[PDB]
């Protein structure tokens, strides 16, 4: 089969901008059958370019497409807010049909420290015989950032879960949220209950803590 | 103009046999090719058949070969994809589309979950207030997806971020929301989540305030 990849993994630019995303196949397509296709997040695919280099009906005069042989290019003339969205590529020419795996295009603006807060688990949930500990880190950019949790000190791995939310649509930045989960009993041997965040925009990690009781 | 439908979103259990659906209008069905597409949570697009509803000449992708099995009826122009056994990791969305060599037009996607696990509504805690103050609602322990959460009623919409949930170990997700305030605030305004569930007809209010 032919295998597409995609590159780069995330284009970050800022509305205005040229975006460049590549395809690469593992040997020559034809150009009359190379495709890309457009995702937004819980939205269906929607046909771009197809022949490697034609539009599809409704799409603007600002996509473009050009290659041929094994590289091919999708490109965005300047970035506009609706055009911040997943990219894959496709090829038709010899069966089976493939697909890339996928660019995604999201907007670039001035690095931005988070907010970070820390939460004590309920009385309520206690009660229950599980402890979460919940950890905010509020609008910052870049997406990156790393939560360490802390008890007593120890740092904690594998016993959290975090999740992001998409990139706001106002001020373009991303907020994170961690639970660290524990039992009752491990929850009331220990003391200090500690978030450390590590992000691009923080000189030195911050740590929001309390200690139990 | 053409469309493509497909049938709703379906939960299910391990072992249990499926059969989704793909209705064609707008044009002649009997004259194109119908591809389906699967999406993994998070993951990207793959190909796993195509099927001509003329006269149901069907190809599979090598991956889904003897896995799945597509079909059509041209009577009421539609084409099928089915499963004897599902298996947790079929938790996917799938997407029918046409074929012109491209896809140019597509279905609006299927979500099927497989899962062990069974319907549960969740436990609500409040993630408490201790200058801007956060503060918000855990939504714990629930099956299946979704859950909707508002603020006051929909009367707090400024600073509120609802999370996606995460799946925990033991096949239940949990989700937060949480809204940032002015801090002068926290002695004077009631700040109340409103959580529904509705697979397990599970509605809660949450007032949230300093411990």
């Known amino acids: 089969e032919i295998v597409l990849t995609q590159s780069p993994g995330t284009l970050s630019l800022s509305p205005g901008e040229r975006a460049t995303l590549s395809c690469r196949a593992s040997?020559?397509?034809?150009?009359?059958?190379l495709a890309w296709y457009q995702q937004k997040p819980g939205q269906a695919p929607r046909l771009l370019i197809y022949?490697?280099?034609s539009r599809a009906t409704g799409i603007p005069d600002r996509f473009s497409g050009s290659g041929s042989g094994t590289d091919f290019t999708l490109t965005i003339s300047r970035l506009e807010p609706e055009d911040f969205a997943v990219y894959y590529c496709?090829?038709?020419?010899?069966?089976?049909?493939?697909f890339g795996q996928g660019t995604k295009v999201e907007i670039k603006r001035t690095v931005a420290a988070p907010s970070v807060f820390i939460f004590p688990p309920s009385d309520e949930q206690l009660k229950s015989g599980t402890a979460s500990v919940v950890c905010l880190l509020n609008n910052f950019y870049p997406r990156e950032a790393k939560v360490q949790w802390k008890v007593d000190n120890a740092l904690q791995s594998g016993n959290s879960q975090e999740s992001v939310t998409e990139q706001d649509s106002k001020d373009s930045t991303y907020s994170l949220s961690s639970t660290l989960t524990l039992s009752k009993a491990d929850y009331e041997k220990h003391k200090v209950y500690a978030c450390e965040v590590t992000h691009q925009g923080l000189s030195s990690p911050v740590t929001k803590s309390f200690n139990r009781g | 103009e053409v469309q493509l439908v497909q049938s709703g979103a379906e939960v299910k259990k391990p072992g249990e046999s499926l059969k989704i659906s793909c209705k064609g209008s707008?044009?002649?069905?009997?004259?194109?090719?119908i591809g389906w597409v699967r999406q993994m949570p998070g993951k990207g697009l793959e190909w796993m058949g195509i099927?001509?509803?003329?006269?149901?000449?069907?190809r599979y992708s090598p991956s889904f070969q003897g896995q799945v099995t597509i079909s059509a009826d041209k009577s009421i122009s539609t084409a099928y994809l089915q499963w004897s056994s599902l298996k947790a990791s079929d938790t996917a969305m799938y997407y029918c589309?046409?074929?012109?060599?491209?896809?140019?037009?597509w279905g609006q996607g299927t979500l099927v979950t497989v899962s062990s696990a069974s319907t549960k509504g969740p436990s609500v805690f409040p993630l408490a207030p201790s200058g801007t103050a956060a503060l918000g609602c855990l939504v714990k322990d629930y099956f299946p997806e979704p859950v909707t959460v508002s603020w006051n009623s929909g009367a707090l919409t400024s600073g509120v971020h609802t999370f996606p949930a995460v799946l925990q170990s033991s096949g239940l997700y949990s989700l937060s929301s949480v809204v940032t305030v002015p801090s002068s605030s926290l002695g004077t305004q009631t700040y109340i989540c409103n959580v529904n569930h509705k697979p397990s007809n599970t509605k809660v209010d949450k007032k949230v305030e300093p411990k």
């Open positions: 589309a046409r074929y012109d060599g491209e896809l140019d037009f």
């Open positions: 707008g044009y002649s069905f009997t004259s194109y090719w």
């Open positions: 496709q090829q038709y020419g010899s069966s089976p049909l493939t």
């Open positions: 040997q020559s397509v034809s150009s009359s059958y």
């Open positions: 022949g490697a280099s």
């Open positions: 099927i001509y509803p003329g006269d149901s000449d069907t």
